[PDB]
Design an enzyme around this catalytic site. Structure first.
Site, mmCIF file in Angstrom:
data_model
loop_
_atom_site.group_PDB
_atom_site.id
_atom_site.type_symbol
_atom_site.label_atom_id
_atom_site.label_comp_id
_atom_site.label_asym_id
_atom_site.label_seq_id
_atom_site.Cartn_x
_atom_site.Cartn_y
_atom_site.Cartn_z
ATOM 1 C CB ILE B 20 -1.083 0.016 1.115
ATOM 2 C CG1 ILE B 20 -0.489 0.315 2.485
ATOM 3 C CG2 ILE B 20 -1.843 -1.303 1.164
ATOM 4 C CD1 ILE B 20 -1.480 0.078 3.598
ATOM 5 N N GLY B 21 2.122 1.181 0.336
ATOM 6 C CA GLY B 21 3.058 2.296 0.245
ATOM 7 C C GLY B 21 4.481 1.786 0.057
ATOM 8 C CG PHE B 23 10.669 5.685 4.984
ATOM 9 C CD1 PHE B 23 10.743 6.540 6.075
ATOM 10 C CD2 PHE B 23 10.921 4.333 5.178
ATOM 11 C CE1 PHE B 23 11.069 6.059 7.332
ATOM 12 C CE2 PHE B 23 11.246 3.842 6.430
ATOM 13 C CZ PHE B 23 11.321 4.707 7.511
ATOM 14 C CD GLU B 25 8.707 -4.286 0.924
ATOM 15 O OE1 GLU B 25 9.611 -4.460 1.774
ATOM 16 O OE2 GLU B 25 8.467 -5.102 0.005
ATOM 17 C CB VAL B 26 3.404 0.347 3.983
ATOM 18 C CG1 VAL B 26 2.341 0.396 5.080
ATOM 19 C CG2 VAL B 26 4.553 1.271 4.291
ATOM 20 C CG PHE B 90 -5.919 -1.661 7.371
ATOM 21 C CD1 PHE B 90 -4.866 -1.463 6.495
ATOM 22 C CD2 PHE B 90 -7.209 -1.589 6.885
ATOM 23 C CE1 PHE B 90 -5.096 -1.196 5.160
ATOM 24 C CE2 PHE B 90 -7.445 -1.318 5.551
ATOM 25 C CZ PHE B 90 -6.388 -1.121 4.691
ATOM 26 C CB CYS B 91 -6.408 3.813 8.537
ATOM 27 S SG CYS B 91 -6.221 4.187 10.267
ATOM 28 C CG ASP B 134 5.793 14.147 6.078
ATOM 29 O OD1 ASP B 134 5.665 15.021 5.186
ATOM 30 O OD2 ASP B 134 6.050 12.945 5.835
ATOM 31 C CG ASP B 152 5.616 9.071 7.353
ATOM 32 O OD1 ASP B 152 6.395 10.018 7.095
ATOM 33 O OD2 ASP B 152 5.933 7.876 7.168
HETATM 34 C C1 LIG Z 1 3.030 7.564 5.655
HETATM 35 C C2 LIG Z 1 1.805 6.652 5.655
HETATM 36 C C3 LIG Z 1 0.990 6.602 4.355
HETATM 37 C C4 LIG Z 1 1.888 6.227 3.204
HETATM 38 O O1 LIG Z 1 1.765 4.925 2.701
HETATM 39 N N1 LIG Z 1 -0.034 5.579 4.449
HETATM 40 C C5 LIG Z 1 -0.960 4.646 5.055
HETATM 41 N N2 LIG Z 1 -2.152 4.388 4.462
HETATM 42 C C6 LIG Z 1 -3.042 3.599 5.064
HETATM 43 N N3 LIG Z 1 -4.316 3.405 4.428
HETATM 44 C C7 LIG Z 1 -5.355 3.652 3.459
HETATM 45 C C8 LIG Z 1 -5.239 2.639 2.350
HETATM 46 C C9 LIG Z 1 -5.853 1.408 2.563
HETATM 47 C C10 LIG Z 1 -5.717 0.415 1.601
HETATM 48 C C11 LIG Z 1 -4.966 0.655 0.443
HETATM 49 C C12 LIG Z 1 -4.856 -0.382 -0.476
HETATM 50 C C13 LIG Z 1 -4.131 -0.204 -1.666
HETATM 51 C C14 LIG Z 1 -4.026 -1.251 -2.547
HETATM 52 C C15 LIG Z 1 -4.623 -2.456 -2.248
HETATM 53 C C16 LIG Z 1 -5.341 -2.640 -1.055
HETATM 54 N N4 LIG Z 1 -5.446 -1.596 -0.180
HETATM 55 C C17 LIG Z 1 -4.335 1.902 0.244
HETATM 56 C C18 LIG Z 1 -4.466 2.908 1.212
HETATM 57 C C19 LIG Z 1 -2.773 3.047 6.281
HETATM 58 N N5 LIG Z 1 -3.470 2.240 7.077
HETATM 59 C C20 LIG Z 1 -2.717 1.995 8.172
HETATM 60 N N6 LIG Z 1 -1.553 2.663 8.046
HETATM 61 C C21 LIG Z 1 -0.460 2.710 9.004
HETATM 62 C C22 LIG Z 1 0.843 2.064 8.536
HETATM 63 C C23 LIG Z 1 -0.259 4.085 9.634
HETATM 64 C C24 LIG Z 1 -1.585 3.311 6.881
HETATM 65 N N7 LIG Z 1 -0.687 4.105 6.271
#
Ligand SMILES: CC[C@@H](CO)Nc1nc(NCc2ccc(-c3ccccn3)cc2)c2ncn(C(C)C)c2n1
Lengths: 251, 308
Positions: B20-21, B23, B25-26, B90-91, B134, B152
């Site tokens: 999903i991300g 900096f 690998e998330v 998870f958000c 940030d 972040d």
């Molecule tokens: C700097 C942080 C930024 C940068 O990546 N992002 C981020 N986005 C999230 N979700 C909101 C979403 C939920 C799902 C997806 C998705 C994408 C593709 C396939 C399946 N799902 C993408 C974003 C999220 N949920 C929990 N966290 C923690 C690690 C804090 C999250 N951190």
């Protein structure tokens, strides 16, 4: 929250005991590591705070790991390497290897920074730092009695002298005892003022309320316990050569 | 032989589900036993020649400290059986992907709410002596049940009242404050509140309002929307060396409310943005004083989120 506080029955039955290490012995394996830490920390020009943090790491580390598998001389440098980062006084991995070496082998010459031998011991340290982290389960924010010492000493208008002595006691409680594994910083702090007072014939005028100086610092604290612990601490202080001379009134 | 490890679980207890991300690998992941969804940030031990990364330690310090309904939540830290994973709740959404998608639509009540949660999230961390450093919509997550979280803390750092010498290279360009662009190293909360101003606008515009190619370019966009940087407006700007050593217009007037009337209708909302996008940090609205703004206390009142 009670995770890193243990009972005397738990402290006796420790990872090291279960590998045959006597209590008295394990106990001096800690003191030793603490010395190594202080020794290294002064040469690396980091603070006492950083050294204290490393010592607490060392202490908690050996409530999970055994001395028979993890030698103090190996854990201590890695623990100090970590504490320094965690406390804002980062020292370089090569720099810490150097100092550890001369501390543990004042004679032996340093290996070629390019050799396979040296390249390993760097690997090793880094691995060890990783094991300490996981062993502590990433809880690295420590709280030391020293913070609370300031507070308790405003509450007795104490002189410089008595203040300095209390800090001395504090720092020594980490090197010489497992209090930090049994009693919370604030309590230990009261213990350190109690004995600093005793050692200086300093008097504590009961408050107007009939309240004692300590009840202001920690509710759970009873004189019955204060006396018990300052005894324990003083006992080992006396066993420790030259240490008491440091605060003895030569006059 | 194997080593004892009571307080670090092997991350194999989660099943990965998707990247999903971005900096660093998330992944989204699912707890093998309960189904609980989580996010895992791997800690990148690449180009790391100084043991476990100090900044990771910083972040982990801060996440353990910040515990609050509007701040992302670090559940635990995990290992492999070698690297290390941060484990969050998870958000389901993030405010960037909400503002781009065009079917998503916001009522005034829903917007007041978002901002309210976000200004509260800030108050909390500032109160806890942390600077986020940030601010940007992409770091503002929202949960299925409609609660906002900030994320972040990779760049976050603690702050105090010691003068200070904090890093200047912080904050995504489009959300960086003036203060920073002028090489300031003794700043504080008001930098995060500038971010919030930009995001507050981005709520009616679906787009980052000042997209610059470089500092020079950026600073110029700012002086174009908020007027020129003069000591009559921002007392003691001249004190900075990069001040004159840089191209800045001189005939610029504050068009903050003018340019935004189009998308933003509510006049209270405008008045608020205008106190967020203030050039002088020491005159830029507090996160406290902002939550107290008549925008949050007038109709429509802030409402929950199901406009999903
Ligand atoms: C700097 C942080 C930024 C940068 O990546 N992002 C981020 N986005 C999230 N979700 C909101 C979403 C939920 C799902 C997806 C998705 C994408 C593709 C396939 C399946 N799902 C993408 C974003 C999220 N949920 C929990 N966290 C923690 C690690 C804090 C999250 N951190």
């Amino acid at each position: 929250n009670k995770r890193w506080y243990f009972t005397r029955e738990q402290l006796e039955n420790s990872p090291s005991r279960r590998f045959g290490v006597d209590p008295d012995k394990e106990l001096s394996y800690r003191q030793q590591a603490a010395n190594l830490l202080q020794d290294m920390g002064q040469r690396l020009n980091v603070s006492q705070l950083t050294i204290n943090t490393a010592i607490v790491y060392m202490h908690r580390f050996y409530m999970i790991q055994s001395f028979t598998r993890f030698p103090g001389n190996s854990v201590a440098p890695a623990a100090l390497f970590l504490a320094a980062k965690v406390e804002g006084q980062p020292k370089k991995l090569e720099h810490v290897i150097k100092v550890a070496h001369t501390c543990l082998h004042p004679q032996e010459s340093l290996p070629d920074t390019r050799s396979e031998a040296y390249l390993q011991q760097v690997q090793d340290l880094v691995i060890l730092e990783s094991i300490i982290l996981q062993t502590l389960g990433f809880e690295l924010t420590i709280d030391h009695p020293h913070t609370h010492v300031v507070k308790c000493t405003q509450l007795v208008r104490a002189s410089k002298d008595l203040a300095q002595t209390s800090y001395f006691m504090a720092t020594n409680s980490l090197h010489l005892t497992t209090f930090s594994l049994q009693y919370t910083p604030p309590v230990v702090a009261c213990v350190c003022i109690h004995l600093a007072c005793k050692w200086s014939n300093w008097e504590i005028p009961v408050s107007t309320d009939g309240k004692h100086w300590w009840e202001y610092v920690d509710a759970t604290v009873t004189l019955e316990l204060l006396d018990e612990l300052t005894h324990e601490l003083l006992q080992i202080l006396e066993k420790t050569p030259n240490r008491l001379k440091r605060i003895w009134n030569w006059r | 032989d194997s080593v004892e490890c009571p307080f670090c679980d092997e991350v194999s207890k989660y099943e990965k589900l998707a990247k999903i991300g971005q900096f660093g690998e998330v992944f989204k992941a699912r707890h093998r036993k309960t189904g609980q969804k989580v996010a895992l940030k791997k800690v990148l031990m690449e180009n790391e020649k100084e043991g476990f990364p100090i900044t990771a330690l910083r972040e982990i310090k801060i996440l353990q400290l910040l515990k609050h309904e509007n701040v992302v939540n670090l559940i635990e830290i995990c290992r492999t059986k070698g690297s290390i994973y941060l484990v969050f709740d998870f958000c389901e959404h993030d405010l960037a992907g909400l503002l781009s998608n065009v079917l998503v639509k916001f009522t005034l009540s829903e917007i007041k709410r978002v901002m309210q949660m976000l200004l509260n999230g800030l108050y909390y961390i500032h109160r806890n002596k942390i600077l986020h450093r940030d601010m940007k919509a992409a770091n503002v997550l929202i949960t299925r049940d409609g609660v906002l979280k900030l994320a972040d803390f990779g760049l976050a750092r603690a702050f105090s009242l010691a003068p200070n010498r904090y890093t200047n290279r912080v904050v995504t360009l489009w959300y960086r404050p003036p203060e920073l662009l002028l090489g300031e190293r003794d700043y504080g909360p008001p930098i995060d509140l500038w971010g919030a101003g930009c995001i507050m606008a981005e709520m009616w515009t679906r787009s980052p309002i000042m997209q610059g190619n470089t500092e020079q370019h950026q600073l110029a966009l700012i002086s174009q929307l908020c007027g020129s940087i003069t000591p009559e407006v921002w007392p003691n700007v001249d004190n900075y060396e990069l001040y004159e050593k840089l191209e800045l217009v001189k005939g610029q007037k504050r068009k903050v409310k003018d340019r935004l009337k189009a998308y933003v209708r509510d006049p209270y909302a405008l008045d608020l943005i205008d106190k967020l996008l203030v050039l002088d940090p020491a005159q830029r609205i507090d996160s406290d004083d902002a939550l107290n703004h008549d925008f949050f206390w007038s109709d429509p009142m802030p409402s929950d989120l199901k406009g999903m």
